[PDB]
Design a protein that fits this description.
Chain H: This is Proteasome subunit alpha type-1. Chain H: Keywords: Acetylation, Cytoplasm, Glycoprotein, Immunity, Isopeptide bond, Nucleus, Phosphoprotein, Proteasome, Ubl conjugation. Chain H: It comes from Bos taurus (Bovine). Chain H: One of its GO terms (cellular component) is cytosol. The structure is cut from a larger assembly and holds eight protein chains of eight kinds. Chain B has about 200 residues and is α+β, with helices and mostly antiparallel strands. In chain B, about 30% of the residues lie in helices and about 30% in strands. The longest helix of chain B is centred in the first third of the chain and has 22 residues. The radius of gyration of chain B is 16 Å and the shape is globular. Chain B starts with 8 loop residues before the first strand and ends in a 5-residue tail after the last strand. With about 240 residues, chain C is α+β, with helices and mostly antiparallel strands. Chain C has one domain. Helices cover about 40% and strands about 25% of the residues of chain G. Chain G is built from six helices and ten strands; from the N terminus they run αββββααββββααββα. The chains are: A alpha+beta (about 200), B alpha+beta (about 200), C alpha+beta (about 240), D alpha+beta (about 230), E alpha+beta (about 240), F alpha+beta (about 220), G alpha+beta (about 250), H alpha+beta (about 240). Chains in contact: A-C, A-E, A-F, B-D, B-F, B-G, C-D, C-E, C-H, D-E, D-F, D-G, E-F, E-G. The interface between A and E is small, with 9 and 9 residues.
Chain lengths: ~200, ~200, ~240, ~230, ~240, ~220, ~250, ~240
């Protein structure tokens, strides 16, 4: 699993691979690891599939009730706080690393990382999963401030492609989501749409 | 390991219009025999029987609790239980202890009331029922019983042929098991009568 | 006969008389007023001095429910203190759960639901107090809410609760609070409190003033002593002609 | 707020030895809409009147005849919300029976369990007895059943009976018209005639609700079939 | 068994009278009218409209907070009649029930199911003697995929039903008679016709010409199933269209 | 055990083998591994058989109650949510893994549910010890929007591969075809395996067994 | 809360429990249940108060309930409370059988149900059960037995007793006519028929208005059976023949 | 009437009669006086004896090293409240290793005593307390009521015939602030003596004195430690 969220001026760009494994067997090669928590809030799930699914369902339920009560669009910080509270209260029982990314009228695009253990930090960009280790240097050397939405999409696609090439638990297709004020735009990169890097030979 | 603590073997077979249930009689602790007339088959009706193999204490506990529930059911419903309903009741009773399981594998043989259609079934220790059409076996010598039954069973057997088949299968299966034997008791359930026989078996 | 002994019993007319009796108890208390302006909310309480032996500031009817929320109460003071504790717990729990300051409307709704929970059973008694909630934030602006013993919560521009609230409402209606600032609203509140107080009926009172707004940077606090003295002087000189 | 309830019984014996709360619940039932049940040779028909006080109501939204299982149906007389509560409890009891025994509950067992619930509400603390009588039909072992459960928790097996307003006149009419070996269609005709005996106004395919139980199971009769039966009557 | 007969505590707690009635429930029904307001709900062929009168006696009251229209979900809206605090508690309960239904079953609650749940809760209040029933009436508004617009009303007695048109409040009898007359003369009702029917029903039962700030209108349509509250401009346009003819 | 399912152009086809083993011995040669949930929803089971039976029965009962209350046809998403929440709150102690398929107002849906409480919504799924052979068949031959007969043939081929390449699978092939207009519970659908015909006869005759005591009770 | 409490478990100024006496009045308003103990068995003879031409045929018996393989009971009073008490009795019998693997003696079962009744009459604030019960059975200790229990929780053993409507007249008749140690089941049935005939004076005796159940021992087994309509008709015919013979001989 | 038997029943006048009856219970007790200077807080209690052969009832209790109370009303209620306050102070010293502020303790007392006044079957605490404490804010005199209301007082008197003591405290409040310990105790003793009839005089048997200050822990002077404070008191002015 490799997940990635990057913040640009108007919003955020989310990305994930689609491989779910039971050992070395790929049980689901078209998995959708980008979960919409609200209209403009998504989450990236890594770790135990059951734990992440249950936590995402519970946070969706709580955030929907909270937004209905307040008659106001929810904050990305509020969704991150709910995820953090649930993941910290049950840190011994859950195995869930979450990335919460979304757009706010009051705060704009926001990326929050909630790793295993239950800490919460806002970042310009976040990467998670077993395949994120292989792309730390790439995102460190490639990220720059002021990137547009298209540049953020290309950056996320490149990093995900490299991680999928190197990581055995990552692969399949690249699912991208761009969230801004107008709405959420989703796309799937597959086949030759995935960025290609030539293998060095001889 | 826990199921082999006391030994035992229960077998049920289907005839044309009859059922047969058989069990060994040995009661023992590990490799020591205590008694040779332990009851493993319990009547659950006029033409309904249950055989229990496994821990002897769990055999007795399950038989008594099943008799409790069956007596309450028959007092309330005002009728005799059907063998499928009894199988469901045993499954519920065993699954209530899913995390504290009884170490018994019940075997149910009987004729459906008002129809007299033969019914046989077996359940695991947590209550998974398995309704077959030929035979069901349970106990420490299930492989020998399976071989004997698969070799000898025939469809639409008369009660005499059914008796001979189940007797030969049980005798030759418990002759090859260390912790089973010390006699065999066979019940043949017909529409009009029930025949109980003890077989001349080895006592070693 | 006997239809007015329990909050779990309706009258033939369709009334819950225990709640009305609690509201009557509220109507016997001294008057506290609150005015919302374009940049904050100002609270003023006519705190009666029942005995000269009491310390100044004793039995204060202004509370800090949260860093940004103030509370002005009227009625039974023990019930008001319990409701202030409930509001404080609600705000603390909201910050613990959702990670940010509770909106004043949401807090008012929660406390109003808690109050309404005491108007349904014979096992409990309706609260004998009514109170106002004031707050200010950059995103939400100035907000002012009032909760009555029945559990009804409404937003207000200017609210008065207590013995003389109709005269206080008449005095407040003469104010163009939508364009005023907290500095002038403090003096206006002091003048209204001095106007509605009954010198013949009540021997003496203290003027308790508090505000929340941009001048306090979104914090609810007691109005500073200088501004309080200026407002009291202005109120006294306005009473004189 | 306090979630505790009253721990003392609201139904108590009188100096004459009568539970007057049960009698008042029976009066509430007797003030309800007429309901008729007829056990035929090959099935049971449950019939009732549902005339809304206005044409603004949606006749197709609330059903007085309700299925409990695939083979058991319900109809009531008295207070509608109480009937809803009892329908929910009866469905839950039938599903529990199926979970335990893996066979559909017999009509008698479900009637006994519902009557036990009604007795519990007649004796427990801080509650009033239900203000409904239930007409329960079912098909078990190739045989139809018709039962009536009263607010007190007592149940009776009936060939034909009536509840609600003018239920004594309906009972006399059923005594005059009922006979054994009756076919299901004749039973439906007799039930509709029993409803007509006390019906005020014009009876259409929406003013009444009919449910039938037979070997195929229990089902509500659609308004088109009710219209056909009314035209045939 | 005689009319108006009383025995024991049947006037004080929810126990049966000799006639078989529950007087506390009727008293809660009167508590509904104690509020003094009236609301009207009308169902169209592709829409559903709720209109209630908005009374703000004093200018010191922030008018944006005096609302009797609430949204339970994105697609379900309600209008409350009766006691305000009871209405708010019932609205909170309905919101919780809808959210829990979505969490547990994976799809949005139907309007009929929500009305049934609220009616069940109010019935529980009618059967137990330790608590007061709520003196409020709830009318639910929503769009069903199979059946279309839905209008459901539940009362303190535990009774609920679907309606082509319904009313609640002080003048609910006159409004129901007017809606009976309108529905009997059946003709095609578009969204505009349904809104005008509800508005004119309220105006004729209150016998007052309406201003855009004196009423409150919420609608759901098949094209836009989301529940929305009309602004003063749209209400003014509807009122002008009504007044020209 | 080999259980498989596909989504075809108009519904769901479920498949299973009918062999149940206890260790390395075949206990049942005709075992029904496709479980009724609702008239439009069925389920294939793997794992602890008693856990699967009880979980499917409980969810079927709850769905029946839900459909009785609502008066509508049950949704596959409701069954999936109920199953996954119940499995998750037991933290995998209920070792039931399920292939859930059905057709509702939204169309045909297929789910795979795991004992810890994680679900996947896929156009084709496999489960059991023979799941990899059936998955190979699917990945080799599956195409979207197949016809009913083509889907039945594909599921039968997958189950046959599981039967003939896994020691835990065998016997017959059972198919459940679900569409918005009909439901087809084909048991058995194929019989690729049969007992060999006898080459001789065994000795089993009357009087062969010696009897010590005999008691006969006449039932009136 | 205090205002609405009825105080069902408090003493009266004369030391009486009013709710218990009112439940006993309810018993007195119920149908007649009769029990006679003979040498070779014991019988129950209840009056069918549920009579109507539109009523369906009863499954086993309207008022006689089998408690276990060796006992049966008859109830007078509130029917649903009787259902609760019979379910509890069956539960107690099954619990004893589970614990000891022997059928419960009759007096122990009666004592358990009476303990439940007394617990309801002492605490809880609930109304008492308005049921009186007649118990018949056989056990290895005392053979055939007949017991009667009250809503107060008081029980006692009897040779012949009656509860329900016109129970005092039936008790007087049994006192006059019961012969201790000489009763057979046939003479007991004749006495039961004559007592039911005299007590049910408003309605002439017929097999459709009475239910009769007997308890006998048949080769080490207890047989609890309900008399068929023809058998009760023959009993009534014999009673009428004897009455006509007495009329002629007087 | 019908409104004076339950604490959960409002009256048509907006009053709860059970609370007023508990206030009467407080008014039934013997008079005690609390007063404070800039550096000390003093409680002087007029003890009462059931008989000539009975010891005078305790009226001043130890709560903590910086807090003491004087009681008036139901003695068992007073002991319950004192135990609650002692537990609260011990918890404060255990968790924060600092003395609990007096105002926060009084707030806790009010919160605890408000609950029984709103629940069916409970009754108000029929005791009124005068609390003397010293903390970072200096000396404090507090008065609690069965109505769960509490007051911050410069001086206060509760119990029977406390109106005369309150009048004397009103007269001499202007000079209470600058008095030293002996002068403050003499002022309190004169205020307490104002509650006594002419034929009765303050003696070492019926006077209890509790003092807390900046450098002085809370101490109770009962029988022979009272004589230095009694010495110097002039005769009753009549």
């Amino acid at each position: 699993t490799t997940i990635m969220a990057v913040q640009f001026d108007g919003g955020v760009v989310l990305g994930a691979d689609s491989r779910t494994t039971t050992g070395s067997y790929i049980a689901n090669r078209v998995t959708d690891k980008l979960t919409p928590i609200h209209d403009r809030i998504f989450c990236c799930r890594s770790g135990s599939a059951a734990d992440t699914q249950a936590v995402a369902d519970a946070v969706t339920y709580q955030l929907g009730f909270h937004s209905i009560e307040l008659n106001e669009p929810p904050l990305v910080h509020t969704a991150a706080s709910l995820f953090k509270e649930m993941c910290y209260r049950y840190r011994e029982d859950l195995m869930a690393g979450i990335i919460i990314a979304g757009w706010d009228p009051q705060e704009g695009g926001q990326v929050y990382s909630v790793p295993m253990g239950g800490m919460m930090v806002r970042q310009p960009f976040a990467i998670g999963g077993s395949g994120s280790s292989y792309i730390y240097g790439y995102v460190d050397a490639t990220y720059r401030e002021g990137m547009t939405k298209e540049e953020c999409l290309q950056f996320t696609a490149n990093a995900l492609a490299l991680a999928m090439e190197r990581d055995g638990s990552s692969g399949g297709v690249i699912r991208l989501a761009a969230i801004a004020e107008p709405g959420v735009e989703r796309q799937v990169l597959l086949g030759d749409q995935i960025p290609k890097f030539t293998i060095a030979t001889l | 390991s826990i199921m082999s603590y006391n030994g035992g073997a229960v077998m049920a077979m289907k005839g044309k219009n009859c059922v047969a249930i058989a069990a060994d009689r040995r009661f023992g602790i590990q490799a020591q025999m205590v008694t040779t007339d332990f009851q493993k088959i319990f009547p659950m009706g006029d033409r309904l029987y249950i055989g229990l193999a496994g821990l002897a204490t769990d055999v007795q506990t399950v038989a008594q609790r099943l008799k409790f529930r069956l007596n309450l059911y028959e007092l309330k419903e005002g009728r005799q239980i059907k063998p499928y309903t009894l199988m469901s009741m045993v499954a519920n009773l065993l699954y209530e202890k899913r995390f504290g399981p009884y170490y018994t594998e019940p075997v149910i043989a009987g004729l459906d009331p008002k129809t007299f259609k033969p019914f046989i079934c077996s359940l695991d220790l947590i209550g998974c029922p398995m309704v077959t059409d030929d035979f069901v076996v349970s106990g420490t010598c299930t492989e020998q019983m399976y071989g004997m039954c698969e070799s000898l069973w025939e469809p639409n057997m008369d009660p005499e042929h059914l008796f001979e088949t189940i007797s030969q299968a049980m005798l030759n299966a418990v002759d090859r098991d260390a912790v089973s034997g010390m006699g065999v008791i066979v019940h043949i359930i017909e529409k009009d009568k029930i025949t109980t026989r003890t077989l001349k078996a080895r006592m070693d | 006969t006997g239809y007015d002994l329990s909050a779990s019993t309706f009258s033939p007319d369709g009334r819950v008389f225990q709640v009305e009796y609690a509201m009557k108890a509220v109507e016997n208390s001294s008057t506290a007023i609150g005015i919302r302006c374009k940049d904050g909310v100002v609270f003023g309480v006519e705190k009666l001095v029942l005995s000269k032996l009491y310390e100044e500031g004793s039995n204060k009817r202004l509370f800090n429910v949260d860093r940004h929320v103030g509370m002005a109460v009227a009625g039974l003071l023990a019930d008001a203190r319990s409701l202030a504790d409930i509001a404080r717990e609600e705000a603390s729990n909201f910050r613990s759960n959702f990670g940010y300051n509770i909106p004043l409307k949401h807090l008012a709704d929660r406390v109003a639901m808690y109050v309404h929970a005491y108007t349904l059973y014979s096992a409990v008694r309706p609260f004998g107090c009514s109170f106002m909630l004031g707050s200010y934030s950059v995103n939400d602006g100035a907000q002012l809410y009032m909760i009555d013993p029945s559990g009804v919560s409404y937003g207000y521009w200017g609210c008065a609760i207590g013995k003389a609230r109709q005269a206080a409402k008449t005095e407040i209606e003469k104010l163009q609070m939508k364009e005023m600032t907290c500095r002038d609203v403090v003096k206006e509140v002091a003048k209204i409190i001095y106007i509605v107080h009954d010198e013949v009926k009540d021997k003496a009172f203290e003027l308790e003033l508090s505000w929340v707004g941009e001048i306090t940077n979104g914090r609810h606090e007691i109005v500073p002593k200088d501004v309080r003295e200026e407002a009291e002087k202005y109120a006294k000189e306005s009473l004189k002609e | 707020m306090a979630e505790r309830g009253y721990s003392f019984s609201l139904t108590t014996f009188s100096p004459s030895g009568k539970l007057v709360q049960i009698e008042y619940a029976l009066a509430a039932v007797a003030g309800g809409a007429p309901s008729v049940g007829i056990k035929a040779a090959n099935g049971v028909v449950l019939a009732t009147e549902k005339k809304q006080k206005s044409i603004l109501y949606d006749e197709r939204s609330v059903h007085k005849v309700e299925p409990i299982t695939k083979h058991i149906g319900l109809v009531y007389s008295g207070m509608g919300p109480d009937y809803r509560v009892l329908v929910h409890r009866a469905r839950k009891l039938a599903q529990q029976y199926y979970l335990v025994y893996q066979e559909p509950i017999p009509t008698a067992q479900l009637v006994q369990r519902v009557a036990s619930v009604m007795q519990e509400y007649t004796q427990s603390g801080g509650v009033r007895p239900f203000g409904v009588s239930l007409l329960i039909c079912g098909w078990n072992e190739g045989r139809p059943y018709l039962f009536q459960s009263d607010p007190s928790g007592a149940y009776f097996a009936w060939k034909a009976t009536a509840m609600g307003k003018n239920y004594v006149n309906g009972k006399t009419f059923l005594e005059k018209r009922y006979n054994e070996d009756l076919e299901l269609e004749d039973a439906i005709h007799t039930a509709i005639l029993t409803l007509k005996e006390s019906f005020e106004g014009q009876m259409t395919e929406d003013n009444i609700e009919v449910g039938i139980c037979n070997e195929a199971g229990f089902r509500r009769l659609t308004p088109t079939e009710v219209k056909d039966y009314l035209a045939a009557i | 068994m005689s009319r108006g007969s009383s025995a024991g505590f049947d006037r004080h707690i929810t126990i049966f009278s000799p006639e078989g009635r529950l007087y506390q429930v009727e008293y809660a029904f009167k508590a509904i009218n104690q509020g003094g307001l009236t609301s009207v709900a009308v169902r169209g062929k592709d829409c559903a409209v709720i209109v209630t009168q908005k009374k703000v006696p004093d200018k010191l009251l922030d008018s944006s907070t005096v609302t009797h229209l609430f949204k339970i979900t994105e697609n379900i809206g309600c209008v409350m009649t009766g006691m305000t605090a009871d209405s708010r508690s019932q609205v909170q309960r309905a919101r919780y029930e809808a959210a829990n239904w979505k969490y547990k079953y994976g799809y949005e609650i139907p309007v009929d199911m929500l009305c049934k749940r609220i009616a069940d809760i109010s019935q529980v209040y009618t059967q137990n003697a330790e608590m007061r029933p709520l003196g409020c009436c709830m009318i639910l508004i929503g769009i069903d995929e199979e059946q279309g617009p839905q209008v459901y009303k539940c009362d303190p007695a535990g009774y609920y039903c679907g309606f082509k048109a319904t009313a609640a409040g002080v003048k609910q009898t006159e409004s129901t008679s007017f809606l009976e007359k309108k529905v009997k003369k059946k003709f095609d009702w578009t969204f505009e016709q349904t809104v005008e029917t509800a508005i004119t029903c309220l105006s004729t039962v209150l016998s007052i010409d309406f201003k855009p700030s004196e009423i409150e209108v919420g609608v759901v349509t098949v094209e836009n199933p989301k529940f929305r509250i009309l602004t003063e401009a749209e209400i003014d346009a509807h009122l002008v269209a009504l007044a020209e003819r | 055990t080999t259980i498989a399912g596909v989504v075809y152009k108009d519904g769901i086809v479920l498949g299973a083998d009918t062999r149940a083993t206890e260790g390395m011995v075949v206990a049942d040669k005709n075992c029904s591994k496709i479980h009724f949930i609702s008239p439009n929803i069925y389920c294939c089971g793997a794992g602890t058989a008693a856990d699967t039976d009880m979980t499917t029965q409980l969810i079927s009962s709850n769905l029946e109650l839900h459909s009785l209350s609502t008066g509508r046809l049950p949704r596959v998403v409701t069954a999936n949510r109920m199953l996954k929440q119940m499995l998750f709150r037991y933290q995998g102690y209920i070792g039931a893994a399920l292939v859930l398929g059905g057709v509702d107002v939204t169309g045909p849906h297929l789910y795979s549910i795991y004992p810890h409480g994680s679900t996947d919504k896929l156009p084709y799924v496999t489960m059991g010890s023979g799941s990899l052979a059936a998955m190979a068949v699917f990945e080799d031959k599956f195409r979207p929007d197949m016809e009913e007969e083509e889907a039945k043939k594909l599921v039968s081929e997958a189950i046959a591969a599981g039967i003939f390449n896994d020691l835990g699978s065998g016997s017959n092939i059972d198919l459940c075809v679900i569409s918005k207009s009909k439901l087809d519970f084909l048991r058995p659908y194929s019989v690729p395996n049969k007992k060999g015909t006898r080459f001789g006869r065994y000795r089993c005759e009357k009087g062969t067994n010696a009897v010590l005591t005999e008691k006969v009770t006449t039932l009136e | 809360s205090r205002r609405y409490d009825s105080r069902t478990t408090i003493f009266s100024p004369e030391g009486r429990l009013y709710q218990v006496e009112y439940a006993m009045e309810a018993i007195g308003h119920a149908g007649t249940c009769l029990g006679i103990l003979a040498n070779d068995g014991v019988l129950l003879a209840a009056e069918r108060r549920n009579i109507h031409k539109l009523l369906d045929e009863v499954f086993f018996s309207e008022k006689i309930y089998k408690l276990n393989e060796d006992m049966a009971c008859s109830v007078a009073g509130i029917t649903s409370d009787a259902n609760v008490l019979t379910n509890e009795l069956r539960l107690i019998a099954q619990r004893y059988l589970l614990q000891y693997q022997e059928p419960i003696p009759c007096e122990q079962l009666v004592t358990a149900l009476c303990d439940i009744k007394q617990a309801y009459t002492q605490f809880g604030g609930k109304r008492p059960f308005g049921v009186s019960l007649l118990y018949i059975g056989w056990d290895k200790h005392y053979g055939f037995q007949l017991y009667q229990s009250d809503p107060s929780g008081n029980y006692g053993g009897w040779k012949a007793t009656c509860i329900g409507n016109n129970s005092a007249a039936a008790v007087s008749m049994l006192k006059q006519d019961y012969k201790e140690g000489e009763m057979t089941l046939k003479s007991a049935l004749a006495l039961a028929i004559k007592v039911l005939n005299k007590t049910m004076d408003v309605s002439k005796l017929s097999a459709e208005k009475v239910e009769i159940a007997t308890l006998t021992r048949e080769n080490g087994k207890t047989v609890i059976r309900v008399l068929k309509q023809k058998e009760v008709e023959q009993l009534i015919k014999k009673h009428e023949e004897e009455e006509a013979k007495a009329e002629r001989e007087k | 009437n019908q409104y004076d038997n339950d604490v959960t029943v409002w009256s048509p006048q907006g009053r709860i009669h059970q609370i007023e009856y508990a206030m009467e219970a407080v008014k039934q007790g013997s008079a005690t006086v609390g007063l404070k200077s800039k550096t000390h807080a003093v409680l002087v209690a007029l003890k009462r004896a059931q008989s000539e052969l009975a010891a005078h009832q305790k009226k001043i209790l130890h709560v903590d090293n910086h807090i003491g109370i004087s009681i008036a009303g139901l003695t068992a209620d007073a002991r319950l409240l004192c135990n609650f306050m002692r537990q609260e102070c011990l918890d404060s010293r255990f968790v924060f290793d600092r003395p609990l502020p007096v105002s926060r303790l009084v707030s806790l007392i009010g919160s605890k005593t408000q609950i029984p006044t709103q629940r069916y079957g409970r009754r108000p605490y029929g005791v009124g307390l005068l609390i003397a404490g010293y903390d970072d804010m200096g000396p404090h005199i507090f008065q609690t009521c069965p109505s769960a209301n509490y007051f911050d007082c410069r001086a206060m008197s509760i119990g029977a015939r406390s109106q005369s003591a309150r009048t004397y405290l009103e007269r001499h409040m202007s000079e209470f602030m600058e008095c030293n310990l002996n002068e403050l105790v003499k002022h309190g003793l004169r205020a307490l003596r104002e509650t006594l009839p002419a034929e009765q005089d303050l003696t070492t048997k019926n006077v209890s004195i509790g003092i807390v200050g900046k450098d002085l822990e809370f101490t109770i002077y009962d029988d022979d430690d009272v004589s230095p404070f009694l010495e110097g008191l002039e005769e009753r002015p009549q």
